[PDB]
Structures are given as structure tokens and as C-alpha cells.
């Protein structure tokens, strides 16, 4: 059956629909008639398996007859299968069989939101590749179309020890999850099976796969002592220099502890880093009342790895937000347009603790302080007589550049609650943001701005005067268009949070894409998309 021009167009239309769209009646109908015709576009199957009801078998077969006729899907289009929207196995099933397709680098960017596809899996199948329980027991307890989502992860992380931990300490945290656990213990269990499930495939496994397991438990058990040295401390009584003393005092414990030697385990916040122990004499505790500590491991080469541990806190959220920015920045790059943004890690090795990279830095509150300004400061660490207003070329040019990437980034994804506490710069020039306790529009106060600039950010380029500002405003508005080309991966990505438990995504689970996807300003054309941003930073500016 083929349709004539005038309904082609209209079909064309309907095909260029954000996935987050919802199609009408008229509109499936439509696409349902000529649903052979259209085979032919791998962009339109997502709108047809819109169209499907799949609560209607006869429907339901029908729609599979054809899944296995259409051009076949893109990697970032079956994302949207394995969103809640679609229970059905077989159509699950053949987004397993094209995300096979892409390579490990490309998993681990889309994992967190994959090991939250598994809600949407059949529990039953799961339960069944087996053959009260505490998650993290699991593995330091070893006993003496084909694939469905969890096999094709355990397949995947039994060849790719990175993936392997990611794919480790993700399932905890979901086993962690007390809400799940209370509200959908059905859920909870899937997700100790998942864990039991790749501990028993470890274990068939051959001499590094087998290894890759002492590894993971080793892991845990580093950090379940870190835990439990953290929740000693935080009892502490007396002044923070008082509370030092103990942390340094129980690292350097080893009998008790054994947290300052060991045999070189993966960092589960990066795992491509091996780490011989913390260094006890140099572990501190920041100011805040919650206690993180700063910790200095020694990697493999001698080098120095700080982090943060945070215990009593949710790094989910901050968790998928640098998620995120990593994966910008990694799509920023692959079109050739670096950044010098921070993607610093972060990972929750529970619902109730974690680690975050990190980063040599000074915040910008603090530069104030010291040097009066973000010019000044440049000119004491990075001075050059020839270079903008006595500064380094290299450093300015970073500068600008990371402020944009900032500019955009935290537009786009809406993080408020900012201050010169929260946005940190780096003597080689980087600008950057942390703390991403609001998201999505939410903020302390009210009425928060949806550009987030200052005062200081553009004094540091020298005023809306200078050659640096003009390349600034060049920067933000190539990177946002560089960002539109990847809306529909992103919007996939977020909506597969959406049952995710993150503080503001769940207040209104329902409505979290669309405040994205309006960022993106699809409407408009590239060009139009260009003046959008430049009126956004003139408001800015302005205020
Ligand atoms: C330096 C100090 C003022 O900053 C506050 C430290 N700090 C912090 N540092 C982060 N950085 C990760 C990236 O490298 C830099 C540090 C990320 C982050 O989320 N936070 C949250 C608030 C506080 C703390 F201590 F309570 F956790």
C-alpha cells in the first residue's frame, strides 16, 4: 500500500515527533494503515510501536510480525523500548538484540539507565536463570532475540571488567533502595536475583572472569569498613580537629580496619585505577555538619587519588547529573569541540553513602577572598605579558570555553541553587560546577533565573567589551546547537529516571522529560536556535 505525496509529507511530519510526543487517534490510525510503507524508516518504527495497544494480542502479534521486517533500529532509538512504557518481551527482546550492537564505551555511558530498565523485565524469567538476603553479602559468599536484558549485561560485564563494576555496585544500590524495597518488594527481589545471578556467572566463569569476582568483593569489603570507620568518627563528640584525629587514627589502624595496605583492588569510582590503600596522615573532614571526608588513596603508580566519602547522604542525584555532563561532554567531542569542561565521577556505593572524584580546585567565593577577582587570580597563577589582560592565552581560552559549556549545560538541565560556593575554577583555567542538590527547575528561592551567570563569571572575561566575551557567546551558541542533535539520547536517558527515585525527577516523574526537551527548543530551526541564545544570555547579562 502506498500512500500518495500529500499523507507521505504528513507521515514525514509525524515521524519527526520528539519520542516524548504522544500521537493522536487520527494520527495512529494513520501510521497504523501505511505501517508496511513505512517500513522502509528505522526513524519511524518508535511511532509505530506507539501506535500498538499491547494489551490487545492480536494487535500485539501483528506489531512483532513487522518489527522483524523494519529497517533496523539505531542504538539510541531502543532506548525507548526498554522505557516502562513497553512491557512486551519479544519487542524488549529485540532492543537487547540492538543495543548487542553497540560497543562497551557506549553501554557504560547509557548503564545507569539500563540497570533501571530491569524494572520493566519479567521477573519470572530472571528468577528462573537461577540455579533476609543482604545485597552485599552475595558476592563474599561464593557457594563451594535469545537474550533477555539481565543476561546481555552479565554477558557483557563477564568480558569487560569496567563494566563488570559499574554493573556491580549500580544492582546494590538499586538492592540498597529501601523505598523500592517497602513499595515494590516484588522489585527488590528481581534485583537480588540480578546480583545472584551475575555472582553464579562469574563463578562458571574461566581464571580472570573468577578473579574479577575475588575483586568485587574485596570492593565491598573495603568499603564496608570505610562505613563503619566513617560512622565511628561521626560519633565523635568534641571539635572537627578533634574528629581528624580519629579518622587518621582508625586508617592507620590496619589490624582493626585494614583500609591503609592492601592488595591492589580496583577504585569502584574508577575502576581502570588500582589502589594499594588510603594514606591516613592527610585524611580530612570538611566543614559540613554531614562530615564527608577528603581521602588521598595510593594508586598502583604512587600517584595520589583524593576523593570524597560522603556516609548518611544520596549521591543519586549528582550521580546522573555528571552522568550526564560526561556524556555531553563525550558527544560534544566526538563533533570535534572540547570544552575543558570536569566531568569529575561520582558513584554510590549506597543509597546512604558514596565517593566523588576529587578535583584540584579553588572555589570561586574563596577567590574572591584572596585575589579580588578571577583576573586577578589568573594573574598570580598563570600571568603572561603578552597574553589578554596579563593572562596565559592557554588559560584564558580555557576559561572561556568551560564557561560556556557550564553556561549551556546547566541551562539545559536546570540546576539551580548556585553560588560562589558551588562553581570552582582551576589555575589551568577550568570553570566548574558541583553540589547538584536542585535540578530541573527546583531551587531554594524563588523565581530562580534560567541562565546561570554573574557577575563574576564575566568580569573574568574581561566585560561584555572584550574579544573573550564575543568567543564566549560563540562557544554557547555552537554547543547548544551541537546538543539539539542529541535530544532525542538524552531525552531517552532521562526517561528511563523516571522510576528512578531521584529526589527531583519523583516529585513529578510524569512532567521531568518535558522540562528538558522544552531546553532543547525543537520548535525552532538551527538558526532561529542561535538568536534564541544569544537573547537568553543578553536577559542574563542584563541582570
Ligand atoms: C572545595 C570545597 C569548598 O568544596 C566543598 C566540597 N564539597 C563538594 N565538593 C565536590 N567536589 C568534587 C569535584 O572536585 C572538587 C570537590 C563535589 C560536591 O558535590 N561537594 C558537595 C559539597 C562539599 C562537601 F564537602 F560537603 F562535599
Known amino acids: 500500500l502506498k500512500p500518495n505525496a500529500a499523507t507521505r509529507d504528513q507521515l514525514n511530519i509525524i515521524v519527526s515527533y520528539p519520542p516524548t510526543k504522544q500521537l493522536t487517534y487520527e494520527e495512529q490510525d494513520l501510521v497504523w494503515k501505511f505501517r508496511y510503507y513505512l517500513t522502509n524508516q528505522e526513524k519511524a518504527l518508535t511511532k509505530f510501536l506507539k501506535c500498538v495497544n499491547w494489551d490487545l494480542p492480536q494487535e500485539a502479534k501483528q506489531a512483532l510480525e513487522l518489527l ?3 529497517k533496523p533500529m539505531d542504538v539510541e532509538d531502543s532506548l525507548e ?3 516502562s512504557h513497553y512491557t512486551n518481551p519479544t519487542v524488549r527482546r529485540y532492543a537487547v538484540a540492538r543495543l548487542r550492537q553497540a560497543d562497551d564505551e557506549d553501554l557504560l555511558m547509557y548503564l545507569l539507565q539500563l540497570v533501571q530498565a530491569l524494572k520493566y523485565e519479567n521477573f519470572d524469567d530472571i528468577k528462573n536463570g537461577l540455579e533476609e538476603i543482604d545485597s552485599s553479602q552475595i558476592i563474599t559468599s561464593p557457594l563451594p532475540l535469545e537474550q533477555d536484558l539481565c543476561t546481555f549485561l552479565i554477558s557483557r560485564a563477564c568480558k569487560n571488567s569496567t563494566l ?11 538492592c540498597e533502595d529501601q523505598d523500592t524495597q517497602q513499595r515494590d518488594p516484588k522489585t527488590h527481589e528481581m534485583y537480588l536475583n540480578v546480583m545472584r545471578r551475575f555472582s553464579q556467572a562469574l563463578l562458571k566463569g574461566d581464571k580472570s572472569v573468577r578473579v574479577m569476582r575475588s575483586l568485587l568483593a574485596a570492593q565491598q569489603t573495603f568499603v564496608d569498613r570505610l562505613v563503619h570507620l566513617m560512622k565511628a568518627v561521626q560519633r565523635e563528640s568534641g571539635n572537627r580537629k578533634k574528629k581528624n584525629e580519629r579518622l587518621q587514627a582508625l586508617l592507620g589502624d590496619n589490624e582493626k580496619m585494614n583500609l591503609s595496605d592492601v592488595e591492589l583492588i580496583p577504585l569502584p569510582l574508577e575502576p581502570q585505577v588500582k589502589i594499594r590503600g588510603i594514606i591516613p596522615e592527610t585524611a580530612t573532614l570538611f566543614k559540613s555538619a554531614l562530615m564527608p571526608a577528603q581521602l588521598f588513596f595510593k594508586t598502583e603508580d604512587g600517584g595520589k587519588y583524593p576523593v570524597i566519602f560522603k556516609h548518611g547522604d544520596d549521591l543519586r542525584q549528582d550521580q546522573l547529573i555528571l552522568q550526564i555532563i560526561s556524556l555531553m561532554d563525550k558527544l560534544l567531542r566526538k563533533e570535534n569541540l572540547d570544552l575543558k569542561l570536569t566531568p569529575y565521577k561520582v558513584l554510590a556505593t549506597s543509597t546512604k553513602h558514596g565517593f566523588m572524584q576529587f578535583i584540584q580546585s579553588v572555589p570561586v567565593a574563596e577567590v574572591l577572598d584572596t585575589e579580588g ?14 597574553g ?9 581560552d580555557t576559561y572561556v570555553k568551560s564557561c560556556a559549556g557550564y553556561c549551556v549545560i546547566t541551562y539545559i538541565l536546570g540546576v539551580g541553587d548556585r553560588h560562589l560556593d558551588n562553581l570552582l575554577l582551576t589555575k589551568t583555567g577550568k570553570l566548574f560546577h558541583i553540589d547538584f542538590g536542585y535540578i530541573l527547575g527546583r531551587d531554594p528561592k524563588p523565581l530562580p533565573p534560567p541562565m546561570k551567570l554573574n557577575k563574576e563569571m564575566v568580569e573574568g572575561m574581561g566585560g561584555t567589551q572584550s574579544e573573550q566575551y564575543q568567543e564566549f557567546r560563540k562557544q554557547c551558541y555552537t554547543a547548544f546547537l551541537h546538543l539539539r542533535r542529541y535530544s532525542n539520547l538524552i531525552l531517552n536517558l532521562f526517561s528511563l529516571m523516571v522510576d528512578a527515585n531521584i529526589p527531583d525527577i519523583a516529585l513529578e516523574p510524569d512532567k521531568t522529560v518535558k522540562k528538558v526537551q522544552d531546553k532543547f527548543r525543537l520548535d525552532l530551526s538551527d538558526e532561529e536556535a542561535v538568536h534564541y541564545m544569544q537573547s537568553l544570555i543578553d536577559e542574563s547579562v542584563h541582570a
Open 373 to 386: 577577582s578571577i583576573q586577578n587570580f589568573f594573574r598570580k597563577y598563570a600571568p603572561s605579558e603578552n
Open 388 to 396: 589578554p589582560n596579563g593572562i596565559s592565552a592557554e588559560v584564558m
Open 164 to 174: 563488570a563494576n559499574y554493573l556491580y555496585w549500580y544492582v546494590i544500590v538499586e
Open 81 to 83: 523500548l526498554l522505557s
Open 68 to 70: 522483524g521486517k523494519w
